[PDB]
Amino acid sequence: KVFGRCELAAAMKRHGLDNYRGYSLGNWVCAAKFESNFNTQATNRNTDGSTDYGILQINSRWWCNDGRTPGSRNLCNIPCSALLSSDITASVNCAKKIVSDGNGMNAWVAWRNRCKGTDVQAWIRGCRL
Numbered sequence: 001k002v003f004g005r006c007e008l009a010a011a012m013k014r015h016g017l018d019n020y021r022g023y024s025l026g027n028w029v030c031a032a033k034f035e036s037n038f039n040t041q042a043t044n045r046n047t048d049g050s051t052d053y054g055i056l057q058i059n060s061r062w063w064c065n066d067g068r069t070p071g072s073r074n075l076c077n078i079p080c081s082a083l084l085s086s087d088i089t090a091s092v093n094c095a096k097k098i099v100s101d102g103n104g105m106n107a108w109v110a111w112r113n114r115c116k117g118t119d120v121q122a123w124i125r126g127c128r129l
């Protein structure tokens, strides 16, 4: 599914991401925009043979099992395909664990390079929440 900006803001808010570990909602919406363009079916292969999955491009080397990344962990205890559902719950619950692990949202390269230090508020501007 391809969310709209405010639709996705509202789903993330309902799932408890607004202010999670001190990151306001605009941060999570900006990151989804630049990681997946709000498309829950996005996949992308990395140089090391791992793959990133879903609206927040979560990586199979650590976080989910796709049966094809030798020597990887599955720290969110899910198959990676669960992260491509039109229901973002699986992605959000795994992201909360990632963002809790010490390095915050710097885990998301596109957040670091395209959202960090910008007016992330703008991403929720105009939405009724």
Ligand SMILES: [Cl-]
Pocket: 024, 025, 026, 027, 120, 121, 122, 124
């Ligand atoms: Cl915000």
Ligand SMILES: [Cl-]
Pocket: 021, 103, 104, 105
């Ligand atoms: Cl932090």
Ligand code: NA
Pocket: 060, 061, 062, 063, 064, 065, 066, 069, 072, 073, 074
């Ligand atoms: Na894995």
